[PDB]
Amino acid sequence: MATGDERFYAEHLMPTLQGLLDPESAHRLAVRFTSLGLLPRARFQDSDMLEVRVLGHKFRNPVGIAAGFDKHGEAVDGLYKMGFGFVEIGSVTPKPQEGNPRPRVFRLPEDQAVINRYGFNSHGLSVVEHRLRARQQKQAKLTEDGLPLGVNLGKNKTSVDAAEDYAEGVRVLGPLADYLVVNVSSPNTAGLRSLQGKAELRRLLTKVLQERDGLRRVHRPAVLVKIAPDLTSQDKEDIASVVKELGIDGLIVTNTTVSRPAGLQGALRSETGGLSGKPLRDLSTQTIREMYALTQGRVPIIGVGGVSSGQDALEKIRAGASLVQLYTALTFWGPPVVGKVKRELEALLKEQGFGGVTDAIGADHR
Numbered sequence: 001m002a003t004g005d006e007r008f009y010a011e012h013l014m015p016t017l018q019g020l021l022d023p024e025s026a027h028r029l030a031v032r033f034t035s036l037g038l039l040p041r042a043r044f045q046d047s048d049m050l051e052v053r054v055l056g057h058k059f060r061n062p063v064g065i066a067a068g069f070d071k072h073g074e075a076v077d078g079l080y081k082m083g084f085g086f087v088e089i090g091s092v093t094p095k096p097q098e099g100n101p102r103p104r105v106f107r108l109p110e111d112q113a114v115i116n117r118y119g120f121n122s123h124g125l126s127v128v129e130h131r132l133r134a135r136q137q138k139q140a141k142l143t144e145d146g147l148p149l150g151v152n153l154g155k156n157k158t159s160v161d162a163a164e165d166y167a168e169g170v171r172v173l174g175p176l177a178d179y180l181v182v183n184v185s186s187p188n189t190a191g192l193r194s195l196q197g198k199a200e201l202r203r204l205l206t207k208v209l210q211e212r213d214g215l216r217r218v219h220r221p222a223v224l225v226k227i228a229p230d231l232t233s234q235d236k237e238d239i240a241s242v243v244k245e246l247g248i249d250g251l252i253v254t255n256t257t258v259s260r261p262a263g264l265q266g267a268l269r270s271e272t273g274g275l276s277g278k279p280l281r282d283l284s285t286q287t288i289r290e291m292y293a294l295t296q297g298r299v300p301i302i303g304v305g306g307v308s309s310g311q312d313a314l315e316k317i318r319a320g321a322s323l324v325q326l327y328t329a330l331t332f333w334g335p336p337v338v339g340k341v342k343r344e345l346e347a348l349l350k351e352q353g354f355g356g357v358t359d360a361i362g363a364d365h366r
């Protein structure tokens, strides 16, 4: 049934697609195809067990699309139709930019992994602002029905003041976002990840929250920080402190890794960039675990990295995540992966004696 669809995509459709197109062309086609909503609605009906209340909002299910698939806000509606409980677009930079030269996305099918070095290719704030404005009341209804929208902000390659880039993003897209993400963890913009250090981070985030707080109350988003899986213990302890001190609304844990775990088999494993997918999974889960402990369970976490199943999702939830995202799993399993994760998650939750997702959040720590 759903298993027959899963198998079709996994064994026939996706490998054929991966044979005809390069990874970037495939990405661009998927965004186009998804934006038209051509694929029929996902059959899976979200149970009440999957509902989460966090970040000032209701999420009808805890499975979202990670930043990077839809950088420019072109496919938001098509992604809700696929069954995602929330959609995050971006990263968006203030001014339009190309990103890095091609080729810049690489598949590692033997590892169920991707490496990318897009470098924040972005239509920029103005284009994305108008795109979101065109569908603003549709989104207001989606959100009220439990399907929120996040906006992930980046910075221009050549920008002098990182904090002003993020501030601009807060000003322009904050009023259109249920939550904002300060992406300080892209491996593909020089200097960016050092925004994660204590002094810079506190200065940056103070400016961001101050700009957010200046928005009219009805258009005031939660602000989250997205961190790398490659942080030192000092880094993490420092982020936890700053986040608690400033009252940051949550964390996204994690971005892609600049590491190359032992055992990667893919021919393209030494390409420069962020690695995503299955080899990232446990490194992300452990980072979630640590950040939840360091913040005493008081700071919501969206868990991301290598989620391709219900077990993967629950592991992150039990480690401390209130919500989860995926992207890379889609490039191997296609759209059916979304219903797969939700069905399996629900089964596992029953099986382990949780009334719903909310009861499982942080359970490993208790």
Ligand SMILES: Cc1cc2nc3c(=O)[nH]c(=O)nc-3n(C[C@H](O)[C@H](O)[C@H](O)COP(=O)(O)O)c2cc1C
Binding pocket: 066, 067, 068, 069, 071, 090, 091, 105, 114, 116, 118, 120, 152, 183, 226, 254, 255, 256, 276, 277, 278, 280, 304, 305, 306, 307, 325, 326, 327, 328, 329
């Ligand atoms: C093609 C590609 C582009 C990405 N671009 C962004 C980005 O613009 N901003 C961001 O915060 N994360 C970006 N990500 C990182 C993902 O949001 C996510 O953190 C990471 O891929 C781990 O999740 P995954 O294993 O499910 O794919 C990108 C990932 C990939 C695969």
Ligand SMILES: CC/C(O)=C(\C#N)C(=O)Nc1ccc(-c2ccc(F)cc2)c(C(=O)OC)c1
Binding pocket: 017, 022, 023, 024, 026, 027, 028, 030, 031, 033, 034, 039, 069, 105, 107, 114, 330, 331, 332, 334, 335
């Ligand atoms: C990492 C860049 C990347 O996106 C890919 C690669 N390589 C890739 O294959 N993407 C990719 C390719 C195909 C799909 C997809 C497959 C069937 C369908 F009806 C709609 C989209 C998706 C998808 O479901 O997006 C929501 C993503």
Ligand SMILES: O=C(O)c1cc(=O)[nH]c(=O)[nH]1
Binding pocket: 068, 091, 116, 117, 118, 119, 120, 121, 183, 185, 186, 187, 188, 255, 256, 274, 275
């Ligand atoms: O645009 C990119 O290169 C990119 C950004 C990011 O945050 N993460 C990632 O893996 N790639």
